Structures are given as structure tokens and as C-alpha cells.
Paper text:
Aminoacyl-tRNA synthetases have become the focus of drug discovery programs in several disease areas. − Compounds that target leucyl tRNA synthetase have already entered clinical development for TB treatment. This report focuses on lysyl tRNA synthetase (LysRS), the enzyme that charges lysyl tRNA with lysine. Aminoacyl-tRNA synthetases are an essential part of the protein biosynthesis machinery, responsible for charging tRNA with the appropriate cognate amino acid for incorporation into growing polypeptide chains. Molecules have been reported previously targeting LysRS in Plasmodium that block parasite growth. , LysS, the gene that encodes LysRS, is known to be essential for   − and has been classified in the top 200 most vulnerable genes to target for inhibition of growth. The crystal structures had confirmed that the compounds from this series were occupying the ATP pocket of LysRS.
Following the successful addition of a hydroxyl group at the two-position of the cyclohexyl ring, it was subsequently examined at the 3- and 4-positions with a methoxy at R2. At the 4-position, the hydroxyl retained potency against LysRS and gained KARS1 selectivity compared to 24. In KARS1, the equivalent residue is Asn497, which forms hydrogen bonds with the bound substrate lysine and Arg485, thereby blocking access to this part of the pocket. In LysRS, Thr425 is too distant from the bound substrate lysine and Lys413 (Arg485 in KARS1) to establish this hydrogen bond network, thereby allowing access of 27 and explaining the gain in selectivity. The crystal structure of 27 indicated that there was space to extend the hydroxy group deeper into the pocket. In a bid to develop this further, to explore the potential for interaction at the 4-position, a carbon spacer was added; again, this displayed good LysRS potency, but the slight decrease in MIC potency, for both 27 and 28, prevented further scope for optimization.
Numbering used by the authors:
A (entry chain A), B (entry chain A): 12 to 50, 55 to 127, 130 to 149, 155 to 353, 366 to 446, 455 to 499
Write the structure that this text describes.
């Protein structure tokens, strides 16, 4: 209803020569800065402050109101009669609503609560909607969420702190951030249905990237020692609590190191992120518990660990007829089956931060064959607080193998021949990694994927 | 031809038990690091180095070869007979081609040129393609370009240095980088044909963002004091030397400042970028000239400056029948005409860094009406070295005006009602800006748009 009462006070401010949306009011300080510089008498420090009025208490010849700056800091104001204007007091009473941004120049004082008492005051913006929420309305209107709910404020700022931490971490180690195409003639470097968009300029279809690996790899051919890219990827698939079709994603590549190297870094990275952004490696969680991610983290092998949990020897050689069987007696091909069985037994048991290494050849086209063990590739996954957080490879640089690997993939015939060309100019040995920002945050906080981004749907 | 000779030496290395693409060779130092620590005698510093062999000179019982690290630094190697192996020398002669990555452990020495003389040596990767180029092949194969052409190396690293400079600059001033949706239900915050992609998850079409403004604005409602976002946008339109359909783009928003504020920053920003990434504000250019971007930069008004150059008074009031006329006598509506005429007269004259401010209402739906002058909006553009580099607004926060502005835009009817909702919760006065990374680099270097990105097409 009050929609209309608000719109009325707007135009009755316009016509009256009052500006309800001024170009520029002279704020001298953020409320934070007033607080930070003032730990029942009066002081002669004068400031201009601005602030949302998120609490009124109009009372005759004095109105007391609370101002909340964007970040949520608060300073009370006391709009008075004798300090300037009787039209002042009336206009204040008349024209101020709740969720109204308000500039207030004057002196800052101790009260019976730190307030500021006005010489000047002026409306900086007029709300045409009061402040009130289901969680699928918080996401629809993050801009109100951010006003009403502190935790929204804190989470948004966390994601940001975390992303900066990552950049600090990588940069300190000599990593260089790069930009690779989002629109590509064919999308690759991962396994998912791409998004297709039609180009006017070319009259061909183009695909949004599912991942930067293939282009990041061209860079390593190029002479990049150490590279990464933090940026959205697009997977044209369903959404669940760990999956969304557009999400932010880290990738990383270092020359002259293997998956054993890239797992040391990933741990240090993650822990360094905890330190900067959170201040503890003893992570408090919604239920009140604490997940420790400090010290050293356990590595297991996929086949061995799967073997122990099944009570029988599973290997690269174990046939699919055998695996299908074991699979049934709990409830396509080999690689899928190994990972499936592993995840469904060992995977779901895990608590503490855990790496799992030495993976089925079938389901790892891009990662080098293992240096000693036949049948497996030098890939790891990291399961942190029971979430598939991150992946690392010793990267396959043999073009003929890589060609072979791809052709078989297609057989259930257009291959990325430029990718393959690049490799046959010579890619030095490198370990890549991959990590998801939403899950990084989930794994650290227990927040849902839908709370870790500013604007989902 | 040598394609096949190469592929042969690969499999004849495999079968022979030699690994042509090893998982991990123990590099102890980058060539840079060897150089940096060694300004015709011998020294007992031992290292393992890796490097592309970009020059052979095989000669009996000594081969001299040059190794080029990814960044382009060079150390010569001297594969010998007596220092280890006679099969060594032969295998070296036999199996080494050009564009081959090669690990060489041994002692570092002064020669008659700083080389390294080997105990061990081993092929790190085998090329199946020699090193050779038109400019529309350099772009098709940036990974070779980066190997062969220094300037490619330098440019790639420049773009990177520049992007870091921006982040430093903004962060120092207290800006917070944010991530807003690339996929949106309707795309806005600029004027261009969007890219449409179909979603499986929802069975609706979605549009890649043409710009982040509208979502960045929701953030300011949200309580963000100071925000920005450096990231690709997508405009489904033609390519020219200043326009590409996917490009990287900065946007910026500060509360409690106007377009006069955001132009001070933009200048300081740009100049600070020059200092960090280039080391001079006296910019050397291809023709050998120098563009000075130091000191203070000139502001002009659009109508006034257009008036002087036409020799007659043009204003908001000047009719379209008049403008069409002037337009003819050189060779839709008012706003378009003003900007058109301005660009075609004053625009093309400009040399020195120049701001142009106070713009036609029609062609600036999102920027506030000017605080005193009727008919114009408080928007500026920055023309640097004759290129439309950047834009700044005092941002329109009046929702009813903003609603009005939009409806008229549609009339040549679906409006972004959530955008409009956000504004009617109250957006404090803020100045936004917008800047293009490719043009930033063009404007600084004289490089084409197609050289400023890693991977175009
Ligand atoms: C929301 O996160 C994701 N959404 C989709 N739709 N797909 C993936 C993620 C995610 O975090 N992924 C990573 C998992 C660890 C590594 O394999 C890197 C990718 C895949
Ligand atoms: C390659 O750069 C661009 N490509 C397209 N297709 N459109 C634009 C640019 C660019 O740099 N733009 C900016 C110009 C200054 C400001 O108005 C911000 C946008 C628009
Ligand atoms: N492309 C991988 C991430 C990088 C892995 C290392 N090569 C993925 O989408 O999971
Ligand atoms: N959306 C603008 C850039 C930001 C201008 C300030 N609001 C553009 O695409 O040019």
C-alpha cells in the first residue's frame, strides 16, 4: 500500500523545489570512520555523514533516528528544533520514511549512545519501498537481503576476501593471471554439455567455455612458466547443491612439477586462504561444530582404497563384468565403474581433508599415464569436508597419445585439431589443477551454493 | 614433410625405452635465475636447466646449442663427448630436433658466451612440428607466435601487468571487486544486440551480458561504498579496429561523488597504469613518435565545443530539422545528431588527452540529468590518443525518471522491472565509469586490438 504514499511524497518534494535524489551531497566521513575516531558531553568535531534511516523515533521537538551505512555500521542521529529550523523538524517528520538515505552535517556527541546532532540535513535518496523473507526471495532480491541481513553483508565480503587471498597466494609464488576466450569454436578441457549461442558477425554457432584448460595449455606451449585464470565457466546442465550452470572456477598450471607438486600447493593455497579470509584453520560451522583443516593431509590410492573397502583386489585389469557385479550387489565401462564404486564406498566415508590419487585411464583423457603403475593416470581429487573441491593432474603432453585418447572419446568425428597442433610444437611437463570457488566456500563455511554468489538464479 | 621424420623419432624413442615426454625432470633453476646470478674460466655451481633448442651447431665431438626458456631468456649449452657419454653425443646428434625442450644438468661456465656443460641431459618434450608469418596466422597460433616473436612475449606480459596495475590502483583506493552474472534473463546496462543461448535446465533462452552496470547498481543499493568488476562482456555485433564481440571491460562505482570525481580518478588510474606497466607517461609509438599523457587533461562541453566548430549556437533546444540540415551540408533524432556532428567535427580534431562532458539526454538513459543545465546529462567520455577510451556518469538514481527513460527507449514492452525495483529501495548518489582494456592498451601503445588479446578470432 505504502508504495503510493511514498511516490506522493516524491513529487510533492519535486514541485516544492526540494531535490529527493540530489547529484552530490558532501559526505566527509563514513560512519565507520566516525566510530573508529571516537571511543555524555559534546565535541566540536564536525562531519557530514550519510546513512539509511532504519529506525525512527519522532517525538515532538526532538526526533531520534538510527543511520546504517552500507557496510552496516551505525550512528544514531538526533534531529532537533533549536539547532537549526522548525520547518526542519516538520520536514524531517513529514518527508522522512524508513529505508531513506539521509545526509546529516553537524557535531558528534556522547549521549545517555554515539549520535550526531545536526546543523544541516538533507534527503540523499527517497525509498518507494519499505524494508520487510524466504531464502528463494533473498536470492531474488540480494540488494534488500544485503540491507536487512548482516550475514548477507558478511558472506558477500567473504567471497571477495577469499578471491583476493587466492590472487595474493598465486601471485606471491610467481603466477600470472591470463584471459582466455569464453566464446570458442568448440568447447573442451572438461566433460559437460556446452551452451550454444549464434553469432551475427560470422553466421556460425559458438560455444561458451566449459573450461579454460585447452587454451591455458596453449599458453604453456607459449612459454608461460606459471599461469592461472579465475573466471566463470558454463556447463549446460542441471543444478543441485554442488552444481550450477554458471560458476566461478580457478585453474592453475606450473611447468616442471607433477601432481605431487600441485597437491602441496593446493593445500597451502587453501590453508593460506583460510588464514587471510577467515583467521582460523579451525572452521566453525552452522551446527556449532569445528572442522580442522590445519597440518598435513592424507593421500590414498583409488584402487587400493577401493580394494580394502570391498574386501577384494580391484585393479586396472579387473573386468567390467566383475565390476558391474559388485556394483549390483550394493545397489558403461571400467573407469566409470571404478570411480562410481569408489565414491559410493570410500568417498562417502571420508571426514578429514583427503587427497585421492591414481585414477582410471578411461575417465582422464587429459592427464598423463602414471609413471610406473600401468593402467592409471597421475590425477588427484581433493575431498574437503566431504565435498569434491579440487583436482590436479600431471598433464599429458604426448600429442599422439592425446590424439588417440580423443578419438576413442568421440567414438561414442571432429577433434580439436588446433589444440593437438599446439601440443605437437612441444608442451613441457606441467601439473595443472582445477578448483571451484562456490565449493571452496561451502567446504569452508557450510553455506549453500546459492548463498556464496551475489546474484544466482 | 619433416612432420613424419619427427613422428618416427618419437616411436623409435618409445620402443628404445627412452621417454620423450617424461613426467618430471628436476629443473633447479630458470635460465633467468642462472643469468641473474652469474655476471673464459669454469665454476662449480651445478644446475639442472630446461629450455627449447632454438639453434643447433653439431660439430664432431662437440655440439653447441642454444636454449630459450619460455620468457625468452637464453643460455647456450655445449653437449660434449668426454664430460659424459659417447652414446650421449650420438643420441644428442640423432634425436634432438629444433623446437625441442631439453633438460641439461651440469656446470655453468664462461666461454670464448655464458653456456652450461653437461653431466646429464634428457629430452623433456619432442616437437612434431618445426618453428617457421602473416598477422592473421600469428593470431591463429599465438602459441608459436609467443615462441618465435619476442614482441608477442612482451605484449602478453604487458596486458597482464596493466590488469594488475588496475587492481592495485582500485584496491588501494578501497574498491572491492565483485562477480555479477554473465547469463541474465535480460541483458542491459548498455546498448548492443546481445548473444542468446538456450538453457536445458530451464527451457528458456538466456542472454550473455552486454555489461554489468545494472547488477553493479543493485550492489550499490546493497550497501557497497566502492565496487568494480574487470571481466568480459559480449556484444553481438560486427568487428572493426576498435570493436570486438567479446572484450574485457572495467566498470567502477563510487558513492558520494559525481562525474567530476570519477574523471579525476580515471585520469590518475590511467596514469598510474602507465607508470607501473610501462615506466613512462611519455609513450613511444610505432612511427617513433611520443604521446605525452602526463600532467592535467582538458575538459570541453559537447554543445559549446560543437557550437564553436560549426560557427553557430547549438543547444538542447536546437531542432532536428536544423541538425539534419547542418548534417547534410557536411556529408533518427536529436541526441544522435548532436553526438554524430560533434564526433564528426570536434571529435576527429583532438590530439591530447581530452574529456568531453555534458551530453544529450536522449542518448544517456542511465545518467542523471545535469544539476543546473537543462536538457543535458552529467556524462563524460575520455578521448585518449584519439580513441574513445572511457565513460563516466553521475548515475541516475530516480526510479520514476528511470522508468520513464526506459519506456520511451522501448517505444522503438518488457522493461527490467527488478532493476527498477532495486532503485526504488533507494540508490545513494554515485558516479559510475566504464573502460575497455583493449583500447586502454591501443591508446597506450598503438597496437591493434587483435594483438592486445592472447586468443582472438
Ligand atoms: C558449482 O560448482 C560446479 N558446478 C558445476 N556445474 N560443475 C562443477 C562445479 C565445481 O565446483 N566443479 C569442480 C570440481 C573440482 C574439480 O574437478 C574442478 C571442477 C565442477
Ligand atoms: C573492443 O572494445 C569494444 N568492443 C565493443 N564491441 N564495444 C566497446 C568496446 C569498448 O572499448 N567500449 C567501451 C568504450 C568506452 C566506454 O563507453 C565503455 C565501453 C565499447
Ligand atoms: N579442466 C579441469 C580443471 C583443470 C584440471 C587440470 N588440468 C576441470 O574442468 O575440472
Ligand atoms: N555500462 C556502460 C559502462 C559504465 C558507465 C557508468 N555507469 C557501458 O557499457 O559503456
Amino acid at each position: 500500500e505504502q508504495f503510493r504514499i511514498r511516490r506522493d511524497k516524491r513529487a510533492r518534494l519535486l514541485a516544492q523545489g526540494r531535490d529527493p535524489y540530489p547529484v552530490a551531497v558532501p559526505r566527509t566521513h563514513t560512519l565507520a570512520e566516525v566510530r573508529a575516531a571516537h571511543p555524555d558531553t559534546a565535541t566540536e568535531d564536525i562531519v557530514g555523514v550519510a546513512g539509511r534511516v532504519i529506525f525512527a523515533r519522532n517525538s515532538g521537538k526532538l526526533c531520534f533516528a538510527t543511520l546504517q551505512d552500507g557496510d552496516g555500521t551505525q550512528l544514531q542521529v538526533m534531529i532537533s528544533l533549536d539547532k537549526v529550523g522548525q520547518a526542519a523538524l516538520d520536514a524531517w517528520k513529514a518527508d522522512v520514511d524508513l529505508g531513506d538515505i539521509v545526509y546529516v552535517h553537524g557535531a558528534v556527541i556522547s549521549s545517555r549512545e554515539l549520535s550526531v546532532l545536526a546543523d544541516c540535513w538533507r534527503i540523499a535518496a527517497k525509498s518507494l519501498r519499505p524494508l520487510p523473507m524466504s531464502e528463494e526471495s533473498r536470492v531474488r532480491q540480494r540488494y534488500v537481503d544485503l540491507i536487512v541481513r548482516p550475514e548477507a553483508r558478511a558472506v558477500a565480503r567473504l567471497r571477495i576476501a577469499v578471491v583476493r587471498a587466492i590472487r595474493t597466494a598465486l601471485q606471491r609464488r610467481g603466477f600470472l593471471e591470463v584471459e582466455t576466450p569464453v566464446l570458442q569454436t568448440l568447447a573442451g578441457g572438461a566433460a559437460a554439455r556446452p551452451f550454444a549461442t549464434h553469432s551475427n558477425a560470422l553466421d556460425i554457432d559458438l560455444y561458451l567455455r566449459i573450461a579454460p584448460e585447452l587454451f591455458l595449455k596453449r599458453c604453456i606451449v607459449g612459454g608461460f612458466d606459471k599461469v592461472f585464470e579465475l573466471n566463470r565457466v558454463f556447463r549446460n546442465e542441471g543444478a543441485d547443491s554442488t552444481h550450477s550452470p554458471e560458476f566461478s572456477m580457478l585453474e592453475t598450471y606450473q611447468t616442471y612439477g607433477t601432481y605431487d607438486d600441485s597437491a602441496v600447493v593446493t593445500r597451502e593455497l587453501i590453508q593460506e586462504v583460510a588464514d587471510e579470509a577467515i583467521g582460523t584453520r579451525q572452521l566453525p560451522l552452522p551446527d556449532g561444530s569445528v572442522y580442522d583443516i590445519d597440518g598435513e593431509w592424507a593421500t590414498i590410492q583409488m584402487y587400493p582404497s577401493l580394494s580394502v573397502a570391498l574386501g577384494e583386489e580391484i585393479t586396472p585389469q579387473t573386468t567390467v563384468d566383475r565390476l558391474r557385479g559388485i556394483a549390483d550387489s550394493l545397489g558403461f565401462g571400467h573407469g566409470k565403474l571404478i570411480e562410481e564404486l569408489w565414491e559410493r564406498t570410500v568417498g562417502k566415508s571420508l571426514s578429514a581433508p583427503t587427497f585421492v590419487k591414481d585414477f582410471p585411464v578411461q575417465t582422464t583423457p587429459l592427464t598423463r599415464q602414471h609413471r610406473s603403475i600401468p593402467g592409471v593416470t597421475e590425477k588427484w581429487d581433493l575431498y574437503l569436508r566431504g565435498i569434491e573441491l579440487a583436482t590436479g593432474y600431471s598433464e599429458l603432453s604426448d600429442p599422439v597419445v592425446q590424439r588417440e585418447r580423443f578419438a576413442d572419446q568421440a567414438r561414442a568425428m571432429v577433434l580439436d585439431e588446433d589444440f593437438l597442433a599446439a601440443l605437437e610444437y612441444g608442451m613441457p611437463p606441467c601439473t595443472g589443477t582445477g578448483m571451484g570457488i562456490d565449493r571452496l566456500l561451502m567446504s569452508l563455511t557450510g553455506l549453500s551454493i546459492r548463498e556464496t554468489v551475489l546474484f544466482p538464479i
